[PDB]
Amino acid sequence: MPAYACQRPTPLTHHNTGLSEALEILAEAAGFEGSEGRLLTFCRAASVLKALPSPVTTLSQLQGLPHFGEHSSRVVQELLEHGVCEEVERVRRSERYQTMKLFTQIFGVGVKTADRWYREGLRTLDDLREQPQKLTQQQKAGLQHHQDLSTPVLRSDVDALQQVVEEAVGQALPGATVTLTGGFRRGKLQGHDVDFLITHPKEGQEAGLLPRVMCRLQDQGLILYHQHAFERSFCIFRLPQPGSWKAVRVDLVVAPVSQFPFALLGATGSKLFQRELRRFSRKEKGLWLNSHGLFDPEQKTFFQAASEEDIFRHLGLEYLPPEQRNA
DNA sequence: CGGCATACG
DNA sequence: CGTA
DNA sequence: GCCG
Ligand SMILES: O=c1ccn([C@@H]2O[C@H](COP(=O)(O)NP(=O)(O)OP(=O)(O)O)[C@@H](O)[C@H]2O)c(=O)[nH]1
Ligand SMILES: [Mg+2]
Ligand SMILES: [Mg+2]
Ligand code: NA
Asked: Which residue has the closest alpha carbon to C3 C1'?
């Protein structure tokens, strides 16, 4: 088992679901406390289990696995022996964990905002609604639409949205393309949002595109919220339903075609996969990776990629299709 | 011990 | 600060 | 919290 998640296939469904979910609770709780390092270790340990070919049934099967030390091993030991880990259950029922989860789930609220509200004594969504002067416009939208945004987006919803995005994109710039990214590209059947990447085959034609797309979607009555030159937009869309509609989060990204493989890789995820890939690039290969390119700081040159396959090859990694990037 | 991804709105 |  |  290699130490980095980008060195091994991780499928969407696997053989250690309950163990990985427990470790991910501890990761989330670490994040709520500001401990990024412990969040990373628990996430990485969880992801190792996702990559295993069969269920862990005995503690000895963790020997030698990366990211399993005394703490993560004890959690697994307790789950194997008793079906429950007391530390995990204590986190689950704690007021701090439940409220931070509730608040950080709001669009426009991160850990630092949630923590401040917690310390001020706020505990419920209605607590926040009763003091709406202290909310950003983004938080107001996240709170108004919170119930709909709490409903999973279905793969059935994605086809309808991609068609309306393509229509607006086609009027804004004929020949521009729309690619589904994020979790759905990795094979997820549901999601918290829909993520799209937009480009044009002629380098430079994509400049100025996203304002033109957003204005057109807004004219069609499809935009319930957006932030407004820009190249990423975090929107709330009106999606039809039988007899009505529901609010759905949609992310749009524009990239020049020269950067498209890097933007596609960076937007396809998973989040942990991308962090691990960027860490691998810099620490093992001495190259700096982001969603625009791959830089050699010794030659001061950028690597021209025509595909995601190119990027894995330039990093000396076996290619992983999106469905195996579910770290 | 230092390090823990990286960029845009 | 928020977002991906 | 764990790795190197
Ligand atoms: O912190 C982050 C968040 C997101 N991303 C990148 O942006 C992509 C979309 O980010 P996302 O927040 O839409 N997550 P996704 O995997 O689509 O699952 P879901 O919760 O169902 O929407 C992710 O898959 C990563 O590639 C990061 O690189 N870092
Ligand atoms: Mg998504
Ligand atoms: Mg998204
Ligand atoms: Na949030």
From this structure: A234
Helices (H), chain A: 17-32, 36-51, 70-82, 86-93, 95-104, 111-119, 125-129, 137-144, 146-149, 155-172, 182-185, 209-219, 260-268, 271-285, 308-314
Cα A222 to Cα A39, A142, A165, A271: the distances in Å are: 37, 17, 10, 28
Q: Please identify which of the residues A127, A148, A251, A296 carries the catalytic annotation.
A: A251
What residues line ligand 1, using a CB cutoff of 6 Å? A 182-183, 188, 191-193, 195, 251, 266-271, 274
CB A281 within 8 A of CB A179: no
For A186, A203, A278, the CA distances from A273, given in Å and listed in that order, are 12, 28, 9
Contact (CB, 8 A) for A149 and A138? no
CA dist A296 and A302 (Å) reads 6
Resolution (A): 1.6
Domains of chain A are 1-94 (1.10.150.110), 95-151 (1.10.150.20), 152-257 (3.30.460.10), 258-326 (3.30.210.10)
Task: Give residue numbers, 90 to 109 of A, with CB < 7 Å from strand C.
Answer: 106-109
Structure tokens that stand for A50 in this block: 């996702």
> Residues with Cβ < 8 Å from A179, sequence gap 6 or more?
A196, A197, A198, A199, A264
**Residue A253 to residue A251: CA distance in whole angstroms:** 7
Number of Cβ within a 10 Å radius of residue A262: 22
The residue among A150, A265, A158, A260 whose CA lies nearest residue A205 is A260
Angstrom distance (rounded) from CA A221 to CA A229: 22
This entry's atomic model was obtained through: X-ray
Contact yes or no for A73/A90 (Cβ under 8 A): no
A301: part of which helix (H) or strand (E)? strand A301-302
Total residues belonging to chain A: 327
Q: For residues A119-129, b (16+ Cβ closer than 10 Å) or e, as one string?
A: eeebeeeeebe
